[PDB]
Point group: C3
Chain length 222, copies 3
């Protein structure tokens, strides 16, 4: 079942990527960079999850699904780049703030991988450092990055706020599931965790970019 769930996930990622490609051909004032990011996220995630479907992107250590961290260390900084570019839509870019989010996010994913390879107190030290990074990402998202969005007008700021809440609600679920599942407290079964880390990322990747791209495209004049 776990293999078939990952094949299904990879197929959905491919369909999402093809949909964003089709949208990119009639871009409605959204820059090509947003369409590229929206395609790379699911194609990379799809490849990483295909490796799990094929029985390659996991090892016994309990099963470490290490291909999830290979996925996230690329897909999650790109999702924050997408969020930042939405805040900056129609205005000056702040690439310093964008790269601040990239740095926090790459660190967060690495601490999760090291936490997964760790045992005892050590595991929860790494986990806690990753949670601290996520807290700072959310502080930036609802603080300075939101102030940039507000500077780009009512309609853009409304859309940014929707995308920021959508992202934040889904992202807090990842460390929650991690802690409850086999990598942490071992309260939830492996299959439960697998389903959560199939369904969450469908919404976090393809769902996020449908919401984000549709909302930006709606701002288009003629």
């Amino acid at each position: 079942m776990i293999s078939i769930l990952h094949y299904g996930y990879s197929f959905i990622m491919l369909l999402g990527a093809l949909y964003f490609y089709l949208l990119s051909k009639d871009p409605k004032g959204v820059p090509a960079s947003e369409y590229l990011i929206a395609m790379v996220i699911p194609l990379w995630s799809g490849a990483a999850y295909l490796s799990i479907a094929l029985g390659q992107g996991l090892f016994q250590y309990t099963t470490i699904y290490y291909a999830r961290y290979i996925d996230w260390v690329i897909s999650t900084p790109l999702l924050l780049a997408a969020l930042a570019l939405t805040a900056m839509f129609g205005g000056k870019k702040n690439l310093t703030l964008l790269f601040s989010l990239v740095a926090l996010d790459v660190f967060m994913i690495i601490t999760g991988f090291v936490a997964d390879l760790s045992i005892g107190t050590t595991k929860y030290i790494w986990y806690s450092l990753g949670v601290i990074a996520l807290i700072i990402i959310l502080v930036i998202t609802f603080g300075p990055l939101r102030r940039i969005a507000l500077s780009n007008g009512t309609r853009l700021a409304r859309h940014y706020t929707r995308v920021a809440i959508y992202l934040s609600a889904l992202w807090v679920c990842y460390p929650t599931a991690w802690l409850l599942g086999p990598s942490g407290l071992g309260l939830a079964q492996e299959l439960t965790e697998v389903l959560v880390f199939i369904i969450l990322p469908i919404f976090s990747k393809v769902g996020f970019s449908i919401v984000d791209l549709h909302g930006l495209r709606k701002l288009h004049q003629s």
Copy 2:
């Protein structure tokens, strides 16, 4: 012989790098970025191939030898080659860094699928290989489609140079997956030594030859 071939390759990479450095000192309207890219490609490749010459950048796996240092080479040198190609198309005009990074992403993916295919067996190997070939097809579609249209937007003379470089690169690059499939990593029709020689000769043309053709052509556009 295999060790000596790799030492020889690394020496040729170093000579190429020194030549591009000397050209960079009298740049003839070509931006410093193009000279830097042209030097990083052969120096990185030369270091990776030095690791093979020293007996380090390879291991035994499925009874075959995986020359893993080739993938360490290509995952850096090949996206830089497409960046060089893209910057040629954009010469004298607005840069499209979105298209350039599209090529970088496709290319890094392509090299990673090759490495994973090499570590794989059976149907799994050809799934990864096939995904890398699809990435190369999309790179070539970009090269002869939208990237060529950018070159044409920069005028007849630039577009003539771009088209020459695009054909040169494309002709060499389609050889890599062809050799890979025929050789020990794939169907095992071609012998290890044949594959070693192909993956010594091809990259001399793909790296140093490409940047000689590209930089000479760009420098020729300069009026002194």
Copy 3:
């Protein structure tokens, strides 16, 4: 002792990062990018050294403190980015020159890691390539990068020269200690090398950015 030294180091890195964050809130004409670089360097290094403190970022092979290379491959190109941005302060950026330093530096760290995994002549081939990369970094630092600093006026060039000497003096210590210690000739003891690679980087990361940011901030008035 080795574990406690690494915990202490990680704590000093955290305090440095928090100090640079506080400076960033009243930036005195220094761009946000400089404060971001100044924070990433010690936080990344702190995390890498925490892995050693916890007994994770090392293996027996001699002990390879592999977490040092994970640290340096990110922290050292960022330090050269900081140095390059200082030279370019108040003028046009030369990102080609900056990325030239990044490329040489990442290569240098990788040769050190490969040298550490190597034995005999092979070890010293990789080590020598890394030393050549460092010499080119220093030639750039005191040649073309210093000429950019001089183009940005007397006060900036005075500050740049101070931070270039500070960085250069510390950086030449790393390959010297590496060669003398267990990874090289094995003349210096493991504990001596551990202390050198605790003290040097405190000056190379937090000390460097205190000197750099204080000097740039002083140019505001």
